[PDB]
């Protein structure tokens, strides 16, 4: 099968072929949004050309999209370790039409690329796809364009709880370009639970979602009220990791070949005896985010954008304690990282004693605390009574140890015990209320 290296490649050629210009991934960190955390779309760096305030050269293009969803809109580090289909760090790729082609050529070119003899070559019969409800159009083109069969064809309404709150209505913001998608799953057998979408236990990984493709029709206002696009638009976002695991056979994304790789340089730097665990693809997951934030000029600190980095690294630092390393360990997988990453990895091997020595350090400085924190919390949940954690020891091991609540959290989940977030919320607003009575401004 091809190299995830080769896959990336391939979907560019695709639609480079196809008269799309290839654009290059932006950063991680974005450009001009306050708003926003870190880049979590291919769509970001062309926000703007959907909304027809800049205009460029090209009516189409293709990326290969960094992304990072750890906060904000979409955060899954709470699902890394535990879903075979999220990680922080992945990347998106996208093909994008600036009031060019819209619906039924959006469709054909997905279609051709996943299931040509001369492309992906995936089988038909293991494809499903989704629409928006009330995209009339989409199920036509999907029906009589395409062949798949009704069965296969599901609608999604509005099943957030609210207008326009809807899987099949795609919006990265409060604000910004937005409209009704369809998805494209692939049904990675019965072995798995899960159902397909539009059930209960649509969330499992046995259907799993590959490609989605936006239909930029609006702009929705801060009143919430959607305003028309100029030209209605086409963003579209398949993840590279999920479209590899489908290709290279496996079920989860952490069985590519890029993972493999990147997991058994973790058991090595670790003295990790297994294959794989929780642990060992968490920290395979972390170093991506970690290293590709710090070159992107995100450096650790205990506000904003600095914080979720330095959060990421110490809980991947944790878990490098549960692993049982014995020394610094987390910046040695950078050169590991730089090696699986390719092409995508030269702006890192750049920065490469950069970004070492930033993570060097702060693994450096939170193992001053990390085991004396992680036996007073084993020494707090020994003499627990009930399945929470106060939020005053959370509290505690955040003020003396500088456990973030989320790492405290993930620690007790192994235990499945929970932690009381709001007694610890509570606790940092008295300790705030205290600096405000003391220094007096
Ligand atoms: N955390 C993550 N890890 C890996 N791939 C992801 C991801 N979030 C999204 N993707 C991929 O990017 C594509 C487009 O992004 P989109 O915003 O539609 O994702 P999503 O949040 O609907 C996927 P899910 O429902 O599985 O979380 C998805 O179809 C998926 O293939
Ligand atoms: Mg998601
Ligand atoms: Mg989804
Ligand atoms: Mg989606």
């Known amino acids: 099968s091809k190299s995830t290296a080769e896959i990336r490649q391939a979907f560019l050629d695709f639609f480079h072929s196809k008269g799309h210009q290839v654009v290059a991934s932006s950063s991680l960190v974005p450009h001009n949004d306050p708003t926003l955390l870190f880049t979590n779309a291919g769509m970001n760096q062309f926000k703007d050309v959907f909304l027809g305030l800049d205009k460029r050269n090209y009516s189409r293009a293709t990326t290969s999209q960094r992304c990072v969803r750890a906060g904000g809109k979409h955060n899954d580090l709470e699902n890394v370790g535990y879903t075979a289909r999220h990680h922080t760090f992945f990347e998106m790729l996208g093909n994008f039409s600036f009031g060019d082609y819209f619906k039924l050529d959006a469709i054909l070119f997905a279609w051709l690329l996943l299931t040509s003899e001369k492309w992906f070559a995936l089988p038909k019969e293991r494809l499903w796809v989704t629409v928006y409800e009330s995209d009339d159009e989409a199920y036509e083109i999907w029906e009589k364009e395409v062949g798949i069969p009704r069965e296969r064809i599901i609608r999604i309404g509005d099943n957030k709880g609210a207008p326009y ?43 799993i979602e590959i490609w989605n493709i936006v239909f930029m029709q609006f702009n929705r206002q801060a009143d919430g009220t959607m305003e028309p696009l100029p030209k209605p638009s086409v963003d579209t976002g398949m993840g590279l990791e999920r479209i590899a695991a489908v290709l290279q056979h496996v079920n989860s994304n952490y069985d590519i070949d890029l993972f493999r790789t990147l997991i058994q340089a973790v058991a090595k730097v670790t003295g990790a005896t297994d294959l794989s665990n929780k642990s060992l693809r968490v920290i395979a997951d972390h170093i991506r985010s970690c290293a590709f934030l710090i070159a992107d000029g995100v450096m650790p600190s205990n506000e904003n954008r600095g914080y979720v980095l330095r959060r990421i690294i110490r809980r991947a630092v944790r878990h490098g304690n549960m692993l049982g390393a014995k020394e610094t360990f987390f910046y040695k ?33 939170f193992a001053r605390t990390l085991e004396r924190g992680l036996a007073l919390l084993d020494e707090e949940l020994a003499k627990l009574s009930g399945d929470t954690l106060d939020g005053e020891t959370a509290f505690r091991l955040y003020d003396t140890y500088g456990f973030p609540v989320d790492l405290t959290a993930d620690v007790c989940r192994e235990r499945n015990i929970k932690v009381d977030e709001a007694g610890f919320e509570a606790a940092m607003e008295e300790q705030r209320r205290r600096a405000r009575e003391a220094s007096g401004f």
């Open 333 to 365: 997988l950078v050169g590991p990282l730089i090696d699986v990453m390719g092409s995508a990895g030269e702006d890192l091997k750049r920065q490469q004693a950069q970004v070492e020595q930033v993570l060097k350090t702060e693994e450096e400085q």
């Open 165 to 207: 709150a809807s899987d099949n209505f795609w919006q990265m913001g409060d604000t910004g370009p937005c409209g009704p998608c369809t998805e494209i799953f692939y049904d990675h057998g019965d072995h798995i639970w899960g159902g397909p979408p539009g059930s209960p236990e649509e969330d499992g990984d046995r259907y």
